[PDB]
Amino acid sequence: DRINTVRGPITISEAGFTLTHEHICGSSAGFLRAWPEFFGSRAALVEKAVRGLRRARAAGVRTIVDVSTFDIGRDVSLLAEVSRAADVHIVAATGLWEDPPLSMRLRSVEELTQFFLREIQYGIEDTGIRAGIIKVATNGKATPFQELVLRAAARASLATGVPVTTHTLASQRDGEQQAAIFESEGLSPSRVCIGHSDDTDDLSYLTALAARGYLIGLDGIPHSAIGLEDNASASALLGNRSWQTRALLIKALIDQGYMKQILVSNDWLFGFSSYVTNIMDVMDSVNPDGMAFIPLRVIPFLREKGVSNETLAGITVTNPARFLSPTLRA
Amino acid sequence: DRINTVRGPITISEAGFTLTHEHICGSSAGFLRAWPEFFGSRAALVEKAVRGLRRARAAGVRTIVDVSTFDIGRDVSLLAEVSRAADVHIVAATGLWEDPPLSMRLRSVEELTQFFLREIQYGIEDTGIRAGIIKVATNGKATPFQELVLRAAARASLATGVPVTTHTLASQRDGEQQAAIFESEGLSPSRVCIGHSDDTDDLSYLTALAARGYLIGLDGIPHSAIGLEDNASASALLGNRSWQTRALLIKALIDQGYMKQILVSNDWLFGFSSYVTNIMDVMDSVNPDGMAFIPLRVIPFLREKGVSNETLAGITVTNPARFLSPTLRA
Ligand SMILES: CCC1(C)CCCCC1
Ligand SMILES: CCC1(C)CCCCC1
Ligand SMILES: OC1(O)C=CCC=C1
Ligand SMILES: OC1(O)C=CCC=C1
Ligand SMILES: [Zn+2]
Ligand SMILES: [Zn+2]
Ligand SMILES: [Zn+2]
Ligand SMILES: [Zn+2]
Structure with missing residues (x-):
């Protein structure tokens, strides 16, 4: 009945329109503390994030899920500052x-479970701020350590009811192995979102996950390098499929009966140090709406393609609330 | 005429007996903040480090060089706390x-130079504490990024006079490639210590470095897994050569005319999270003297083998002061 945010517990009704896969800053552990000038300054990053979240709020967003982990350089004090200034739950x-x-990387499955439980049940470093989601990742076949991470995420979710959300290399169908590992630990698919699933057009892969009960993260809708002439790094990161092609996967899964299992987001950021220099400028030129892209561009696009307002409100309000509210079976 | 420590500038005379390659804690960026229970507690780690440094001080140590970088999880506030409580410069x-x-890893040589200069000339994150040495690493042939790191270290040293110290895989003769890269940037070998050089018995490699003017870091004297029955992880980390074999390399280089180019240390730690769990307990059982091993065991050993007190005072007092005092040519 309560979701943990960086400003404390909120009720399920308070979450409202929720973007389920976003980042204030995509970085590395300790990096913002040690080299804030990389972002201009810490204050410049804060100001950019507050302006972006205020524009998202004006477009209807009420909550974002920042899926930055320890190794993305998650700074919960930064998230709390931006959340308070923008009036958007994080x-x-x-x-x-x-x-x-x-x-x-040297830790056991048991040690990793203790660490994830620390951040859910006690707090992130000394802040008392508690995590409301567990993020994990593979890029192709899981490394031995990534198998331990997936298992520890399942154990932390089984103890707390907090959901799991994943990064995949969708072209390698990573969700299949992720699902197998989660299920081997006894985790319900209703507690798991297989993310970056809009990176693929393979409906057999997407429906195989949805048929088992997984939530499907169509979370990078504005990511596209179409019309970027000869930028190899942006093309490798963003892909050559249009935002419309990605957005139509939302309609595809609705038309197959999976409207209650779709989660939509932008996978946007306000700073980005874990990739090439100036990538944030390139991305901002592609999508000046930032996190407001989903409500301002994707929702009207899907309405014109015949999707109802009610169905889209279910996807952007009802589904994130069901996913985020702690439970062992949703 | 001044060396930066975690408590401010000290004179060259104040450095005294100096251990040139040590760690308060071998960790990862942000790890101690996010998971202090891994070390029992932060307070337990502090207490262990203070007790260890106090024992080293009683044995004659006055300064240690903590060669923990950003990615070793260097916490300069922790170093300052331990330095004040133990009365040992760090x-x-x-x-x-x-x-x-x-x-x-995604940064350019110019960006990396800016970061190293930030930490030498301005301060480490928001503490105002300035670095007094630049640490770099290879393990075999340098990766493309490691080549950039070595070049940026040379540029930072050329601008500031602060020396460079290296991690090597000594069995692969890494010092040869490190030297070639440093010299391509114009760095004087007198500003460079090639570390972990006691990991090898190859006198042709060691004398080739010393003949060019490099300082030779015989920095892991107590590292040995001899007498550890069937501990594969400790054997892989510590090696099967005795501490006496390592220490005799000090005499070997003295006998070849290189007494002024030898730097000696323990490469000890009080916490160690970047390796297998409980490694610190294994290491403490091998060497209960910790950082006091050099003065309590190595110095008397070398005296018995015929090395003079004057020569050993030159190695442990004069050489570190010449190395650490900022200059472009020492
Ligand atoms: C029948 C699928 C549906 C038209 C339901 C109402 C929202 C839009 C999709
Ligand atoms: C001649 C080498 C030397 C005996 C000099 C004094 C210190 C010990 C070594
Ligand atoms: O994996 C990601 O979602 C994280 C940050 C950026 C881009 C992609
Ligand atoms: O490379 C090292 O010196 C760093 C920490 C530990 C062990 C070895
Ligand atoms: Zn991702
Ligand atoms: Zn992401
Ligand atoms: Zn090393
Ligand atoms: Zn070391």
Whole structure:
């Protein structure tokens, strides 16, 4: 009946329109503290994030789930500052992404479970802010350590009811192996979102996940390098499929009976240090709406394609609330 | 005429007996903040470090160089606390070790130079504490990013006079490639210590470095897994050569005319999270003297083998002061 945010517990009704996969800043552990000038300044990053979240709020967004883990350089004090200034709830994450340092990579499944439970049940470092979601990652076949991370995420979710959300290399159908590992630990698919699923057009893969009960994260809708002439790094990151192609996967899954299992987001950021320099400028030129892209551009697009207002409100309000509200079976 | 420590500038005379390659805690960026229970508690780690440094001080140590970089999880506030409580000077490091995160690995040589200069000239994150040494690393042939790190370290040293110290895989003769890269940037070998050089018995490699003017870091004297029955992880980390074999390399280089180029240390730690769990307990059982091993065991051993007190005072007092005092040519 309560979801943990960076400003404390909120009721399910208070979450409202929720973007389920976003980042204030995509970075690395300790990086913002040690080199704030990379972002201009910490204050410039804060100001940019507050302006972006205020524009998202004006477009109807009420909550974002920041799926930055320890190794994305999640700074919950930064999230709290931006959340207060913008009047947008922010749910923080535990888990591990694709860049864990040695002190994480050498840990056992039991040790990792203790760490994820610390961040859900006690607090993130000394802040008392508790995570409301567990983020994990693979890029193709899981490494041995990533198998431990997936298992520890399942154990933390089974103890607390907090859901799991994943990064995939969708072209390698990673959700299949992720699901197998989660289910081997006894985790309900209703507690799991297989993310970056809009990176693929393979309906057999997407429906195989949805048929088992997984939530499907169509979370990078504005990610596209179409019309970026000869930018190899942006093309590799964003892909060559249009935002319309990605958005039509929302309609595709609705038409197959999976409206209650779709989660939609932008996978946007206000700073981004874990990729090439100036990538944030390139991304902002592609999508000047930032996190407001979903309500301002995707929702009207889907309405014109015949999707109802009621169905889209279910996807953007009802589904995130059911996903985020702690439970063992949703 | 001044060396930066975690408590401010000290004179060259104040450095005294100096251990040139040590760690308060071998960790990862942000790890101690996010999971202090891994070490029991932060307070337990502090107490262990203070007791260890007090025993080292009683044995004659006056300064240690903590060569923990950003990616070793260097916490300069922790170093300052331990330094004040133990009455032992601590020099902090900038640079990058073998575990840089994506936000570092994607940077250019110019960006890395700015970061190293920030930590030498301005301060480490918001503390105002300035680094007195630059630490870099290879493990075999340098990766493309490690080549950039080595070049940026050379540029930072050329601008400031602060020396460079290295991690090597000594069996692969890494010092040869490190030297070639440093010299391509114009760095004087007198500003560089090639570390972990006691990991090898190859006198042709060691004398080739010393003949060019490099300082030779015989920095892991107590590291040995001899007498550890069937501990594969400790054997892989510590090696099967005795501490006496390592210590005799000090005499070997003295006998070849290189007494002024030898730097000696323990490469000890009080916490260690970047390796297998409980490694600190294994290491403490091998060497209960910790950082006091050099003065309590190595110095008397070398005296019995015929090395003079004057020569050993030159190695432990004069050489570190010449190395650490900022200059372009020492
Ligand atoms: C029948 C699928 C549906 C028209 C339901 C109402 C929202 C839009 C999709
Ligand atoms: C001649 C080498 C030397 C005996 C000099 C004094 C210190 C010990 C070594
Ligand atoms: O994996 C990601 O969602 C994280 C940050 C950026 C881009 C992609
Ligand atoms: O490379 C090292 O010196 C760092 C920490 C530990 C062990 C070795
Ligand atoms: Zn991702
Ligand atoms: Zn993301
Ligand atoms: Zn090393
Ligand atoms: Zn070391």
